[PDB]
Structure formats: structure tokens, C-alpha cells
Amino acid sequence: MTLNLCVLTPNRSIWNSEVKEIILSTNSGQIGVLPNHAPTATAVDIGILRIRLNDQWLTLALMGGFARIGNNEITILVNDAERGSDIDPQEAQQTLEIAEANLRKAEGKRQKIEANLALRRARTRVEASNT
Amino acid sequence: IEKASLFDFNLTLPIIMAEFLFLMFALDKIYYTP
Amino acid sequence: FNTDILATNLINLSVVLGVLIFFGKGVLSDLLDNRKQRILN
Amino acid sequence: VGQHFYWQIGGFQIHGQVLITSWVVIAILLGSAAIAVRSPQTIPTGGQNFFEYVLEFIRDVSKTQIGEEYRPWVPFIGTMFLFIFVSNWSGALLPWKIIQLPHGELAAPTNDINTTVALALLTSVAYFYAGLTKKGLGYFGKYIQPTPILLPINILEDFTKPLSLSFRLFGNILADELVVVVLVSLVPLVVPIPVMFLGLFTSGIQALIFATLAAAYIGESLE
Amino acid sequence: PLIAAASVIAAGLAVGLASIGPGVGQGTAAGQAVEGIARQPEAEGKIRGTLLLSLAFMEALTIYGLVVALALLFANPFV
Amino acid sequence: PLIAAASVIAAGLAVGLASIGPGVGQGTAAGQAVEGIARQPEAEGKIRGTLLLSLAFMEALTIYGLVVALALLFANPFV
Amino acid sequence: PLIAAASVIAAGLAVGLASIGPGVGQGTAAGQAVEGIARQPEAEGKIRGTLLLSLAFMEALTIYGLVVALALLFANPFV
Amino acid sequence: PLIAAASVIAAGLAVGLASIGPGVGQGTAAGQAVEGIARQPEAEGKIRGTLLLSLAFMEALTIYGLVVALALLFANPFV
Amino acid sequence: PLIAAASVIAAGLAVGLASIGPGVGQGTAAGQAVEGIARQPEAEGKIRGTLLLSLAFMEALTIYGLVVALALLFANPFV
Amino acid sequence: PLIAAASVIAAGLAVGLASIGPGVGQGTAAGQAVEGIARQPEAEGKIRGTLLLSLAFMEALTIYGLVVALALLFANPFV
Amino acid sequence: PLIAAASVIAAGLAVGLASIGPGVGQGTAAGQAVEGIARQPEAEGKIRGTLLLSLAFMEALTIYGLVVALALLFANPFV
Amino acid sequence: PLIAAASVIAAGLAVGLASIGPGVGQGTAAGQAVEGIARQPEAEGKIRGTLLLSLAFMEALTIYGLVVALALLFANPFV
Amino acid sequence: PLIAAASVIAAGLAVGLASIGPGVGQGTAAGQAVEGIARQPEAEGKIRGTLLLSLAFMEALTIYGLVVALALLFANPFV
Amino acid sequence: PLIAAASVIAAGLAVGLASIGPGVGQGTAAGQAVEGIARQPEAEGKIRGTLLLSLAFMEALTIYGLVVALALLFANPFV
Amino acid sequence: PLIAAASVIAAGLAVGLASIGPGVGQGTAAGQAVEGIARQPEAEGKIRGTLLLSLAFMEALTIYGLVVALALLFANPFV
Amino acid sequence: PLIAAASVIAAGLAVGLASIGPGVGQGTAAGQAVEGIARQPEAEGKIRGTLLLSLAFMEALTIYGLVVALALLFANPFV
Amino acid sequence: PLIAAASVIAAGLAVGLASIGPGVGQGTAAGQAVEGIARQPEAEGKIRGTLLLSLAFMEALTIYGLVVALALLFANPFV
Amino acid sequence: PLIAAASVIAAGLAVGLASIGPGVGQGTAAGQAVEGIARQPEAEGKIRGTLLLSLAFMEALTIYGLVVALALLFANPFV
């Protein structure tokens, strides 16, 4: 009747209730899934997912990994994922500000890589919080 | 008088090869070496 | 051998040589001077 | 309009324009150099850092192209750069259509090919001198060492390097000047400035490329 | 008569053909120059200098066909 | 007579051929410029400046064929 | 007679050839512009502005062949 | 006689050639527009607006060759 | 005589050339429309509407070459 | 005489050229339609309806060249 | 005389050109139909029905060029 | 005389052109049929049946050009 | 005289053109047949049977152009 | 006279055209045969047998154009 | 007369054709040179030296066609 | 007179066309042969034997066009 | 007269055609040489030696067309 | 007269066409040879030997067109 979704983190299976649509980011930039999709495997970029089942569609920001989608089924391997409602927006925004400030200072070949990937991490947290 | 007739390959090419190598050796000495 | 006078051959060349001498003395003194400062350092 | 020019005779005819124009090039080069050389200071003063950075650039190109023994050929490749660069920039920026020759326009030393194939023969004498100097007199780069039946291509290759190097520089300077002349008759000086800019942009580069490529043939001798 | 007629056409095809290759060439180069900027915006200053430099090298190719076309139309030695 | 006839055609093919290459060139460049914007919207300001710059470089290529076509039709020295 | 005949054809090929390249060019650009919109719908406003801008740059290329075709048919100086 | 004969052919090739490029162009654009819809059905409203917009830009290219073909056949000034 | 002969051929090439590009164009678009349906069968209703819409836009391109071919054969003003 | 001769050839090239593009077009579309069926056999009913629909749209393109070829050979108004 | 000569050639090129596109078209379609069978042998029954259906649609395209070629050679109304 | 001369050439080009497309077509299809066999040897029986079936469909395309070539050379009604 | 001259050329182009497509076709097929053998050496017996079978199907295509070329040169009915 | 002249050219184009396709064909096949050997050196014995077999099949294609060229130059029945 | 006319055209096509290949060549090289700079900005100094070196090698190719075009127009030995 | 003139050209095009395909063919094969050597240097001995073998097979293709060109220029039976 | 006219054109096309292939060839080679430098800057010394070596091999190809063009214009034995 | 004129052109096209394919061929081979060196610098000695070997095989292809061009210009038996 529909495709089914299991998103899972290295310690914790987050979303294993099943849905009519999701739409997720990727390194190509954007993709959408609807039921009886052809078998595809996408490396998913860090940044928000949007999932629609029935009435309600909500975004949980998730931190990148892999997403294969088989027959009647999606499974998404992400190293960290949070529901966008469960993060309180303002605190996430504050964290983003801190990350930006540290990035602006942060210097040197590894360190910026860390700063840049941390600010990329922080910026997507509010984008699920607002949405 | 006579009209244009360019693309001439007379002894001028040899002549300004000489004046150019003179430039390179004389200009070598005042300008570049010092 | 004789000189050939006409105001078509060189007016195009004066603007070019002026632009190049001005912006070239600018970026050339800046670069050369910077190098000199580094040697002094 | 015209690719004709006036000869001067010493029993044989040589172009007047190219001698006068390259004389202006020799004078501007030695003049600014012997200005910049008179009072050297430990810390580069005003105006001497430009000549210094020129020398640095020349050293770098020769070194990359030649190798560890770049420092004997630095005056040669430096002259190939500076004579061709100052030739093209003097043809571009020095207003010489005010000056009226007896029979021809005065633009650059390189406009007459004679300059181009002379400079190509000088780089040919240079890489032959490097190759017959450092290597065995019996043989240089030309030997069909890789394959005996690679001789025809190799023999042909020697002829081509001076012709392409002679021709590219010559054609390019001449083509650029022609566009400025063929434009100007059609229209007044204001329209043509961008074109001259483009030509001025190539005018250094076909210089630089020449010097670079000349240095590279030295490397093919020394191996 | 015939000389003029041949020259006018030689003037048409010179600029007609010249734009074929570089028209395609600048296209791939520019577009590929943009994609890289999208990938690395911080590198826009670096990318643009080369991209602009390349187009001038490509742009001239059609200039030679433009100049000869004009030298055929306006300063034509043969008529 | 013949001179005019040759020139009118040279005017047709000059602008006819000129659009072939750049027509293709601008296509790949623009389309590839858009895909990058889709990938990185935040880079739209950066991408557009180059994209617009490129088209002008490409756009002229057909201008030379347009100008010569008109110089053939209207300010034709040979008729 | 002959002058008119040459001009009418020059009018046919001018608009005939002009559409070849840009016809292909706009195709890849638009299609690639759409794929990106599908990938990032939120970027549709950003993508469309560039896509529309590009087509006008491409669209004109065939305009020059259209204008010369008409200047050949209607305001023809040579007949 | 000859003038009419030249014009009828110029009318044939004008519409004959015009369809070549855009015929290919609309093809890639539409097909690539569909693939994206398949990938993201929820984006069908967004995708279609651009796709339809693009075809009109592409569709006209053949319109210019159609109009000149008719201006050659029906409202022909030269016969 | 000659006028009729030219027109019949102009009628042959008009419909002969018109089918080249769109024949290729509809091919890629349809095939790519099908692959997406295979990937997402649930999206078949969405995909088909666009695919059918596109072919009509592409299909006409050959219609203009068909109409002019007939206007050349049957309602020919010039004979 | 000449009118008939021109028409017979116009009849040959009309059907000769018409098959070029769609011959290629149907090829990619069908083949790509099959690959998708192989990938998703359960979608064969869905895929086939579109594939058959597409070929008819493509198939006609050569029909116009076939019809004009016959209207040239058999119901030829000009002879 | 001339009428017969034109017709025989129109008969040669009609069948000569007709095979170009579909010859390529059936190639990609069949080959791509086979690869899918290799990937999913269990789907061979499904794949073959479409593949055979497609070739007939493609095969006819050359039939129209074959029929007109014969109508030119054998039942030629014009001689 | 002329009729025979035209026919012999029409016989040369009919078989000359016919082999172009299918020559390419069978190539991709067969080669792609082999790669699949290499991937799935157990499917060789399945793959071969389709591959052989396809070539016959492709092979005929050149048969029509061969038959008309012979009908031109040997059973030529027009001489 | 003329009949013989036309026939000798028809004999040159028949075998000249025939080799174009299949020359390319056998190339991709064979090369792709080899790559698969490299991937699966154990399947060499399976792969070779199909590869050899395919070339004969492709090889003939040039045989028809060879046979007609000879039927033009040696057993020529028209001289 | 004319017969000899036509034949010498038919001899030039026969061998001139014949090498086009197979020249490309053997290229892809051999190169792709080598890449596989690089990937699987242990399979060199297996790969080479097929590669050599393929070239002979491809090599002949140009042989037919070579033979007819000689049959035109040396054992020419028509002069 | 004729000698001058031939030479002016030879001057048009020399520079017309020369720009085709290198126009495309410099395009891919430059664009691919930029993409690499975008990927590795720190390597811009390294990349540019080669890119500039390459264009001069490519740029000359059109210089030979420019020089011969001028040697045809201006210093023409044959008129 | 005419016989000699035709033969000299047939000698020009024979060697002119012959190099087109194999010139491209050897290119892909060699380049792809090198890439594999870069990937597996230990396989250089294996790769080179095939690569050299292939070029000779490809190299001859242009030999046939070279031989016929000389048989046209030097040992020409027809003059 | 005629001899000179033919030679001047042969001088135009010799250098006109010669630049087509290598113009494209050097392009891919250089651009691909740069991308590798971007990927491995430390290998710039290694890459450049081959890249420069290759261009000379490619550069000459247009030299042969340049030399023959000049041998046609200046040291022409036939006039 | 005519014999000389034909020969000079045959001399132009022989070297004009010869450079087309190998000009492209050496390009891909060299560029692909460089990319591999960038990937595996330690393999530069191995790669270069093959790359240089290949170019000579490719380089000759244009030599045959150069030699025949000269044998046409200088040691021409027919004038």
C-alpha cells in the first residue's frame, strides 16, 4: 500500500513508522521518494530531511551518510539525526552563532575543515527547527 | 611609382637579423649585465 | 629611411603605452617594493 | 593597408624601418637599465624592485625550463623575453603613425619576419650550442636512439621547431598590427581600443611563450 | 565584377565559419567554470581570472575571421 | 547585378552560420550554470556574475556575423 | 531578376541556419534547469531567474538571423 | 519565373532547417523534465511551469522559420 | 514548368527535414519518460500528463513542415 | 517532363529523410522502455501503455513524409 | 527518358536513406533489451513482447521507403 | 543511355546507404548482448534467442536496399 | 560510354559506403565482447559463439555492397 | 577516355571510404581489448584470440574496397 | 581576374576552417583547467602555467590559417 | 589529359580519406592501452604486445589507400 | 591562369583542414593534462614533460598542411 | 594545364584530410597517457615509452598524405 522507512543512527533507531512520502537531501542536492520507487542508493548529505505521511509533514535534520531505497522500502544510515520539533529553535540558533564565531577565528588546514564541517552541522539544525 | 607588392623576402631579413643581434649584444652589455 | 608622418599609426599606441606605464608602475612598484621589504625583513 | 617597406643599401638591401625600430628598442632597454643599475641599495629602492622582479621572473622561467644549470643562460633567455616584449609594446604604445617614413609604417622590429626568423635562428644556435657543448660531439638529441625508424620524424622535427617558433611570433605581431590598421580606416580611434587591448594582451604573451619555449629547447639538449 | 563577388562571399564565410568552434569552445569552458564556482564559491576569485583569460584566447580565434572578413570588404587590395 | 547577388547571400550565410556554435555553447554553459545554482542556491550571486559575463563573450561571436551581414546589406562598398 | 532571387534564398538560409545551434542550446539549458528544480524545489525562484535570463541571450542569436532575413525580404537596399 | 522559383525553395528550406535544432532541444529538455518529475512527483507543479515556459522559448525558434516561409510563399514582395 | 518543379521539391524537403530533429527529440523525451515510470510506477499518472504534453509541442514542429509542404503542393499561389 | 521528374525525386527524398530522426528516436525510447521493464517487471503494464503511445506520436512523423511522397507520386496536382 | 531516370534514382535514395535511422534505432533498443534480459532472465517473457513490438514499429519506417521505391520502379504513374 | 546510367547508380547508392545504420545498429546490440552473457553465462540461452531475433529484424533493413538494387540492375522495367 | 562510366562509379561507392556502418558496428561489438571475456574468462566459450555469430550477421551487410559492386563491374547487364 | 577516368576515381573512393568505419571499429575493439588485459593479465591468452579473430573480420571490410579498387585499376573489363 | 578571385576565397576559407577545431579544443582544455582549480585552489599557480602553455600551442593552429589568409590577400605572389 | 587529371585526384583522396578512421581508431586504442599500463605497470609487457599488434592491423588500413594512391600516380595502367 | 587559381585554393584548404583534428586533439590532451596536475600538483614536473612532448607531435600535423600550403603559394613548381 | 591544376588540388586535400583523424587520435591517446602519469608518477617511465611509440604509429598516417602531396607537387610523373 505504501513504502516504509527506517532511519537509524549508530546507537539508536529513530524513525521506524511508515510513510507515504519523504523528500531528502543528498550530495547531488535534492531527491524525492514516492512509493514503488525504483531501487536507488544515494549518499545523503548533511542537512534536513522532509517526510510526508498522510496529513502531516515534518523535518528532522540529519547529519549525512547513506540512503538506499529498495522495493517498497527505504533505509537511511545517518551518523546523527534529530527531530526538528524536538530541538528548540533558539538554542540551536545560539549554537550556530557560536560555531560561526569559532569558524571566523579558526585557521589552518585541518582546523578549518573542522570548523567548516561544524558550522555546516550547526546551520542545518535551525533549518529543521524553523521548518 | 609602383603599387604595394608586400610579402617580399629580400636581404632585409638578413639585415635586421644583424641589427637585432647587435641590439642583443650591445643592450646585453649596458643594460642586462650591469 | 625617410620618416613617414601620419596621425593614424600612433594615437592608438599612446593610450596603450600610457595605460601600461601607469598601471604597470603601480603594480610593479607595489610588487617590487614588497619584495624589497621582505628582503629587509 | 601596406606591407611594403623601404630598403637601405650597402651593396645589398636591408629594411630601414626594422633597423630604426629595433634601435629605439635597444635604446629604451639600455636607457632604463643603466638608470636602474647606478646606485644599488641593500633594500630595493623605488623603481629598482621592478627590474629586480623582472630578473627574478627570468631566473624562474629558465630554471624551470633548463634545470640546475639555469644561471649561464639567464642573459640569453632574458634578452629573448625583453627584446620581444619591448618590441611588441613599443609597436603598440609608441605613437608612430605621426612619424611618416619615406615608404613605410614604423611599428615594431618583429613586424618584418626577418626579426622573427633571426630570433629563431638564435634560439637554434643556442640549443645546438648547449647540445654540442654539454653532450658528446658525436651525437646530440637528434640521434635515432629510441628507434632507428624514428629518424625521419626526428630529422623533420629539428626543422619544425625553429619554423614554428619563428612563425608564431611573427604572424601574431603582424596580425595584431593589421587589425589595428584595417580597423582604423573603417573607423576612428575610439572604436578599436578594446581590440588593441586584446592585442596588447597577446603582445607580451607571445613574447613570454617564446622565451619559455626557447628555454625548454635548451632542456631537450641537456638531457 | 567577379573579383568583387568572390571577395564579398569570402568575407561572409570567413566570419561565418570562424564562430563555429570557439562558439562551442567558450561554452563548455565557461559552463564548467561556473559549476566549479558553485562547488567552491570561495574560489570564485581564482576561477574567474582563468575563465576570463581563456575566453580572450578563444575570443580572438573569431577575431581573425572577423579581421580578414573586413580586410576583404573594406581594405581589399584586389579591387 | 552579380556583385549584389553574391553580397546578399554572403549576408545570409554570415549570420546563418555564426549562430551555430555559440547557440550550442551558451546552452551548455547556462544550463550547467543553473544546475550549480540548484546545488548551491547561496552561491547564486557568485554564479550569475560569471554566467552573464560568459554569455556576452559568447554573444559577441554572433555579433561579428551580424555586423558583417549588415555591412554587406547596407553599407556595402562594392555596390 | 538574379539579385532578387539570390536575396530571397539568403533570406531563407539566414533564418534556417540560425535556429540550429540555439535550438539545441536552449534545450540542454532548460532541461538541465528543470532537473535542478526537481532536485531542489525550494530553489525554483532562484533557478527560473537565471533560466529565463539565459534563453533571452540564446533567443536573440536566432533574432539576428530573423532580422537579416527580413531586411533581405522587405527592406532590401539592393532591389 | 526564376524569382518565384527561388522563393518557393527558400520557403521550403526555411521551415525545413528551423526544426532541426529545437526539435532536438525540446526533446532533451522535456525528457529531462519528466525524469525529475518521476524522481520528485511532489515537484510536478514546479517542474511543469518551467518546462512549459522553456518550450515556448524553444518553439518560437521554428516559428521564425515558419513565418519567413509564409512571407516567402504568400506575402512575397518580390513577385 | 520551372516554378512547379521547384515547388514540388520544396514540398519534399520541407517535410523531409522537419522530422529530423523532433524525431530524435521525442525519442529521448519519451524513453526517459518511461524509465522514470519504471522507477516510480505510482507516478505514472503524473509522468504521462507531461510526456503527452511535450510530444504535442514537439509534434507540431513537423506539422509546420507538413503544412508548408501541402501549401506548396495543393494551395500553391505561384502556379 | 521536368515537372514530373522533379516530383518523383521530391517523392523519394520526402520519405527518405523522414525516417532518419524518428528511426533513431523510437530506438532510444523503446530500448529505454524495455530496460525499465527488466528492472521492474511488475510495471510492464504501466510502461507499455506509454511506450505504445509514444511510438504512434513518433511514427506519424514519418507518415507526413510518406503522405506527401504519395501525394507527389499519385495525386499530383502539378502533372 | 529524363522522367524515368529521375524516378529510378528516387527509388534508390528512398530505400537508401530510410534504413539509416531505424537501422541505428533498432540496434540500441534490441541491445538494451538483451542487457535487461541478462540482468533479469525471469523477465525474458515480459521483455521480448515489448522488444518485438518495438521493432515492428521501427521496421515499418523503412517499409515506407521500400514501398515508395517500388511504386517508383514498378507501378510508376509518371512513365 | 541516360536511363540505364541513372539506374546503375541508383543501384549503387541503394545498397551503399542501406548498410550504414543497421551496420551500426547490429553492432551495439550484439556487443551489448555479449556483455550480458559475460555477466550472466547461465542466461546465454535466453540472450541468444533475442539477439538472433533482433539481427534478422535489423538485417532485413539492408535487404530492402539490396533487393531494390537488384531490381534496378537485373529486373529493371525502365530499360 | 556514359553507361559504363556510371556503372564503374556505382561499383566504387557501393563497396565504399557499405563498409562505413558495419565497420563501426563490428568494432563496438567485438571490443565489448572481449571486455566481457576479460571479466569472465570462464565464459569465453559462451561469449565467442555469440561474437562470431554476430560478425557474420554484420559482415554480410558489406557483402551486399560487394556483390552489387561486382555485378556492376563484371556481370553488368546494361553494357 | 571518360570510361577510364570514371574508373580510376571509383578506384580511389572505393579504398578511400572503405577504411573509414573499420578504421574506427578496430580502434575501439583493440583498445578495449587491451584495457581488459591490463585488468586481467592472466586472461591475456583468452583475450588475444578473440581480439585477433575480430580484426580479421573487421580487416576484410576494407579488403573488399581494396579488391574492387584493383579490379577497377588493373583488371578492368570496361576498358 | 580569376586568379585574384580564387585567392580571395582561399583567404576566406583558410581562416574560416582553421578556427573550427582549436576553437573547440581550447574550450575543453580551459574549462577542464578551471574545474581543477575549483577543486584545488592551492594548485592554481601550477594549473595556470600549463593552461596558458597549452592555449599558445592551440592558438597557433589558427595562426597558420591566419598567416596564409594574409599571404593570400596582401603578399600574394600570383597576382 | 582528362584521364591523368582524374587519376591524380583519385590519388589525393585515396590517401586523404584513408587516414580519417584509423587515425581516430589507433588513438583511442593506444590511449586506452596506456591508461591500463598506468593502472597495472607490471602488465606493461602484456599490454604492449597487443597494442603493437593492433596498430599494425589498423595501420594497414591506410596502407591500402597509400598503395592505390601510388598505383594511381606512378604505375598507372590508364595513362 | 587556371593552374595558379587551383594552387592558391589548394593552399587555402591545406591549412584550413589541417587544423581541424589536432585543434581538437591538443584540446582534450592539454585539458586532461591540467586536470591531472590539479589532482596531483606534486606530479606537475612529470605531467608537463609529456604534455609538451605530445603537443609537438600533434602540432606538426598542422605543420605539414602549412608547409604544403606555402610550397603551393611560394615555391610552386607548376607556375 | 588541367592535369597540373588537378594535381595541385589533390596535393592540397591529401595533406588536408590526412590530419583530421590522427589529429584527434593522438589527442585522446596523449591526454589519457598524461592522466595516468598524474595518477601514477612512478609509472612515468613505463607510460612514456608506449605513448611515444603510439604517436609514431599515428604520426605516420599523416605522413602518407604528406608524401603523396609532395609526390603530386614535386615529383609528379603526369606533368
Curated annotation (Swiss-Prot), chain A:
Keywords: ATP synthesis, CF(1), Chloroplast, Hydrogen ion transport, Ion transport, Membrane, Plastid, Thylakoid, Transport. Pfam families: ATP-synt_DE, ATP-synt_DE_N. GO terms for biological process: proton motive force-driven ATP synthesis. It is found in: Plastid, Chloroplast thylakoid membrane. It is a peripheral membrane protein. One of its GO terms (cellular component) is chloroplast thylakoid membrane. Gene3D superfamilies: 6.10.140.480, F0F1 ATP synthase delta/epsilon subunit, N-terminal. Coiled coil: none annotated. It comes from the Eukaryota. One of its GO terms (molecular function) is ATP binding. Belongs to the ATPase epsilon chain family. Produces ATP from ADP in the presence of a proton gradient across the membrane. F-type ATPases have 2 components, CF(1) - the catalytic core - and CF(0) - the membrane proton channel. CF(1) has five subunits: alpha(3), beta(3), gamma(1), delta(1), epsilon(1). CF(0) has three main subunits: a, b and c. This is ATP synthase epsilon chain, chloroplastic. It comes from Spinacia oleracea (Spinach). The gene is atpE.
Swiss-Prot record, chain B:
The chain crosses the membrane at residues 6-26. It is found in: Plastid, Chloroplast thylakoid membrane. F(1)F(0) ATP synthase produces ATP from ADP in the presence of a proton or sodium gradient. F-type ATPases consist of two structural domains, F(1) containing the extramembraneous catalytic core and F(0) containing the membrane proton channel, linked together by a central stalk and a peripheral stalk. During catalysis, ATP synthesis in the catalytic domain of F(1) is coupled via a rotary mechanism of the central stalk subunits to proton translocation. F-type ATPases have 2 components, F(1) - the catalytic core - and F(0) - the membrane proton channel. F(1) has five subunits: alpha(3), beta(3), gamma(1), delta(1), epsilon(1). F(0) has four main subunits: a(1), b(1), b'(1) and c(10-14). The alpha and beta chains form an alternating ring which encloses part of the gamma chain. F(1) is attached to F(0) by a central stalk formed by the gamma and epsilon chains, while a peripheral stalk is formed by the delta, b and b' chains. In plastids the F-type ATPase is also known as CF(1)CF(0). Belongs to the ATPase B chain family. This is ATP synthase subunit b', chloroplastic. The gene is ATPF2. The chain holds residues 78 to 111 of 222 of the full protein.
Curated annotation (Swiss-Prot), chain C:
It comes from the Eukaryota. It is found in: Plastid, Chloroplast thylakoid membrane. The chain holds residues 22 to 62 of 184 of the full protein. Belongs to the ATPase B chain family. The lineage of its organism: Eukaryota, Viridiplantae, Streptophyta, Embryophyta, Tracheophyta. It comes from Spinacia oleracea (Spinach). F(1)F(0) ATP synthase produces ATP from ADP in the presence of a proton or sodium gradient. F-type ATPases consist of two structural domains, F(1) containing the extramembraneous catalytic core and F(0) containing the membrane proton channel, linked together by a central stalk and a peripheral stalk. During catalysis, ATP synthesis in the catalytic domain of F(1) is coupled via a rotary mechanism of the central stalk subunits to proton translocation. Component of the F(0) channel, it forms part of the peripheral stalk, linking F(1) to F(0). In plastids the F-type ATPase is also known as CF(1)CF(0). This is ATP synthase subunit b, chloroplastic. The chain crosses the membrane at residues 6-28.
Curated annotation (Swiss-Prot), chain D:
One of its GO terms (molecular function) is proton-transporting ATP synthase activity, rotational mechanism. It is a multi-pass membrane protein. GO terms for cellular component: chloroplast thylakoid membrane; plasma membrane; proton-transporting ATP synthase complex. It comes from the Eukaryota. Keywords: ATP synthesis, CF(0), Chloroplast, Hydrogen ion transport, Ion transport, Membrane, Plastid, Thylakoid, Transmembrane, Transmembrane helix, Transport. The chain crosses the membrane at residues 17-37, 74-94, 113-133, 178-198, 199-219. It holds the Pfam family ATP-synt_A. Its main location: plastid. It is found in: Plastid, Chloroplast thylakoid membrane. HAMAP family: ATP_synth_a_bact. Belongs to the ATPase A chain family. Key component of the proton channel; it plays a direct role in the translocation of protons across the membrane. F-type ATPases have 2 components, CF(1) - the catalytic core - and CF(0) - the membrane proton channel. CF(1) has five subunits: alpha(3), beta(3), gamma(1), delta(1), epsilon(1). CF(0) has four main subunits: a, b, b' and c. PANTHER family: ATP SYNTHASE SUBUNIT A, CHLOROPLASTIC (PTHR42823:SF3). This is ATP synthase subunit a, chloroplastic. It comes from Spinacia oleracea. The gene is atpI.
